[model samples]
Target: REHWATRLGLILAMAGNAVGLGNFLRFPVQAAENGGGAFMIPYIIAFLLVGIPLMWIEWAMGRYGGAQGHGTTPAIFYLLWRNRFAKILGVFGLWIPLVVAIYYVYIESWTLGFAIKFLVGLVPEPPPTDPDSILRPFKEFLYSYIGVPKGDEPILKPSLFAYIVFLITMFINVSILIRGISKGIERFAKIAMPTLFILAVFLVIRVFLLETPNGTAADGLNFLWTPDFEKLKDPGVWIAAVGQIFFTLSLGFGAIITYASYVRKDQDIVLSGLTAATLNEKAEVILGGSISIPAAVAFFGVANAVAIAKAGAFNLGFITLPAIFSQTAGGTFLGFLWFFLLFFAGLTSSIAIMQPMIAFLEDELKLSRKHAVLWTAAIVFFSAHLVMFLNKSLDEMDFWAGTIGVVFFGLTELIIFFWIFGADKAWEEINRGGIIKVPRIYYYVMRYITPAFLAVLLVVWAREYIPKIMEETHWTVWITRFYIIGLFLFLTFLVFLAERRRNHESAGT
Candidate 1:
């Protein structure tokens, strides 16, 4: 199962998924919205406790699974979960990747959409002649979303043209995937990902200059670093921070585990896992929260009001960030540069998402890479469209898939180590190929500390979720409620059933 053409491909692919649109686009906005400087506290805590440890777990599982030459769930549930109760837990294996990929493709499509418009010179001017001009389509898009009965002509929400573009983009990803690790995912990331980093750093530096008379740029930087503990009292901030840490890091997802499936037993699993954790924290907390937030705040100035700016933080990255690219530095050329870099980042991450499913298809169904890539793309396409049309549903799907699904996957990897494979055995596998040996404490952490902390976080997340929804009487909110919970359970049971059958079959083999 050590299937990657080269170890670098696996690393690039994993890093790509870990370093994603979420890192560059979402984190800064979420951090600003949460508490700017105060956001760092819980974020740092989650990074050390939640993200890094889970990285170890997933990487360890991947090493173990690869040695066994099986897919994510089959390797764990069928191969390791010989007992009844643990096998029951394995049923939820499909929840995380399946759920996340659905919404992920849709958002990725936005980047693809932007790349198209920028390429075609369709980016709207900031100052439009009329209210209906392409520049300020915010109200129009909003009205279209909320059903503004009569006079609402709606703005730039992904038309049919967008869907066609989305499909083409996804197909390109899948086609590349069929090329296998080096030729497909690795080589692509090695080139595109570096370009992405250079462009992003350049853009951030460029924003550091352009400022207003009142030093609005300085004010934005201050906003990012200035801690407001009052917002710390808000539970959502902690949840968002933790969730972002987990989501952006690709924690608890079997992608890490699946990719590791090809790693030679002698690979330094602990070091690799640590590398991922370090990169994730550096991207999300340091670069995203520290850099992007303050930079955007300074650029936009006080017109939006800091509080509204904070509330609209995330959107600014999606809408305002692009607008900024269109305005400053190289203008439209810069816009092309920014999105093209993001496109590669998105592409690498997308490959990471695809890898686990590909591994599963090959390991379990005996499907070749071609069959796996094509079929999986078809599945991803349909699921993405479903979530896109039902945007509210997409949000809920994001919560469950992005949150609970991750928690479940993380726990599965931990369980596979401590319960099924034995922590000592898993640790040995982890340290087999590495230059550095793993500490004895890693076994204890994997066995006891990591899972316990995740459990507590899970409960707190659940507690906060129920109250937020019950207060929102809107129909859209309720639909999101049902869709998320329902999808989680559906995927959970489906995986359970599939793995259970495989477990029985392997018994005779």
Candidate 2:
């Protein structure tokens, strides 16, 4: 069986996978917008109740599947449920990451491009007169870079540089995947994860020392830690906390499952799972929390910082941080470090995301590792063009594949493991060779509270999404919807064909 080269490599890889753009970009914005310290209350609560438990569950499921020579969810679900339809439903596990990696790698390429630009001092200086004017150049750069149509030239003509960077990103990711897990993915994680930490620590120290006219760094820190008790009363704050927890930990994505599938059968996933989650939380709250919001507040004051927070995470990371870096003392040097850090953070997660599809092609279709990876790369390259040309398709794909699909598959997997597979047996699976005992309380929590938590999340998400869908009845919206449905159907058919081939081989034998 494939196994991690060392225990540390496994831990670091898991941590690396969980700590992505969401850590540095999304978490701070969510904290600031959802009432800062008030958001922490539910965030920790959700992590304990939902996040940690789900981590162990996925690890258990993946390891269980791996022992049976299966890597993706469909075959694993069939083994667990002994039902044919369960395999079809399990296609979501393969589908979510494939769809996400298609567009996610495109975003990853942007960081690499920005890093190169920063190194050569190509980044523009921020406007001095108006604070809001800092946004204009970055916005225009993104428009031109991604081929968004301004008037009527052509919507599909992506910048040549963007395509070059895109190809480079795809090549690196596919190269790593082709080398197999232990030598490629684990080795990269070992280097990248430590470098990411060092860079984050350096940036945190610099941001903490920053001083502005209206408020010093101390005041910026205070803004994050001081709680407004009234904001906790809003349900949206709770939902936002839960959502941040989910996204930050990489919980809903099938990458964790694929990673865990490579573990040695008797390895201790319980302690390892908890340790990885702890590392992710620390990276998020301590490092991620310190940098962007504080820097923005120290420079722009509380009101403008809040406005930037409302502008969204992409704005803060891609637009606002670059502008902030350009004005700081060591602006160019710091800007390169920041974007390179993001590139490392994103590269590790992107590698994990592609593995499930490669695993499925190898395990089910009986393709060689090289062939599986090559096919995965080809498909991702083809799909990425749609999003690269039409930016709205990226948002639509993110909504369906990145966010909603993750939760849907997560909820289904938990139900099958705890309810259908039998709670007692599932508990045994988690405990087998575990270094630390998952307390007796968590067993009950996993069975009852976890499912209830996800159900509420799904219901609330539906409540929110249904209204938007009903209101926006444009042709483009339906086109995206149709694309998602079509992709899912195509994956289902592939799985069906694999099953038929397997059955035929068995009958012939």
- For candidate 2, lDDT tens digit of each residue in 1-509? 56789999999999988998889888988898876778888888889998999999999999899988887898988988999889988899888888888888999998998899889988776676566687687777666777677775334567899899999999999889899889989999989999999999999998888886877767767888887778767777877888778778877787888889999899999999999999999999899989888888888887888888897657777777777776778878898899898899899989888999999998899999999999999999988887887647777787777777877787898999999998999999998999999999999999999899889878977897557875775456566677768888999999999999999999999
Q: For residues 64-86, write the lDDT of model 1, one tens digit per residue.
A: 66777775764466566676665
lDDT of candidate 1? 0.66
Clashing pairs in 2: none
> Model 2: runs farther than 4 Å from truth?
152-157
Position 234, candidate 2: lDDT: 74
Q: Once superposed on the true structure, which residue ranges of model 1 sit more than 4 Å away at CA? A: 84-88, 128-157, 214-218, 226-234, 301-314, 419-421, 439-444, 470-509
Task: Report how far residue 71 has shifted in candidate 2, in Å.
Answer: 1.3
Cα RMSD for candidates in order: 3.9, 1.8
lDDT values, one for every candidate: 0.66, 0.86
Count of backbone collisions within predicted model 2: 0
